[PDB]
Amino acid sequence: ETHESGIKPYFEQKIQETELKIRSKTENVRRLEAQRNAL
Amino acid sequence: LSNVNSDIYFKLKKLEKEYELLTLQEDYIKDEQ
User: Fold this and answer.
1) How far apart are the first and last CA of chain B?
2) Choosing among A3, A7, A11, which should be mutated to test the B contact, i.e. which has the most B CBs within 10 A?
3) Which family does it belong to (chain A)?
4) CB-based contact A15 B9, cutoff 8 Å
5) Is B22 touching A (CB cutoff 8 A)?
6) What's the angle, vertex CA B12, arms to CA B9 and CA B13, rounded to 5?
7) Of B31, B4, B28, which is closest to residue A1 (Cα–Cα)?
8) Chain-centroid distance, C-alpha A11
9) Residue A32, SS3?
């Protein structure tokens, strides 16, 4: 159980680079939705 | 826990194909406005 917990945050490090990106795009593409809705 | 480690990567590779299509949406409504 402790060998499967040390190789598990490094499977997760590759997927967490795309995940942080996807937290900021989501805010950002609704940011440009509001400007575009008023226009 | 060997079923939690094989599902993580898979889910991450699956959901990021559907959020790569919402990042195309950013380019598109930046030029549309």
Assistant:
1) 48
2) A11
3) Belongs to the AAA ATPase family.
4) yes
5) yes
6) 85
7) B4
8) 15
9) helix
Residues A15/B12, Cβ–Cβ less than 8 Å: yes
Q: How was this structure determined?
A: cryo-EM
The DSSP string of chain B is: -HHHHHHHHHHHHHHHHHHHHHHHHHHHHHHH-
Q: Does A28 touch chain B (CB under 8 A)?
A: yes
Shortest Cα–Cα distance, A25 to chain B (Å): 7
**CA–CA separation, B4 and A19 (whole Å):** 18
Q: Residue A38 burial (CB < 10 Å; 0-12/13-18/19+)?
A: exposed
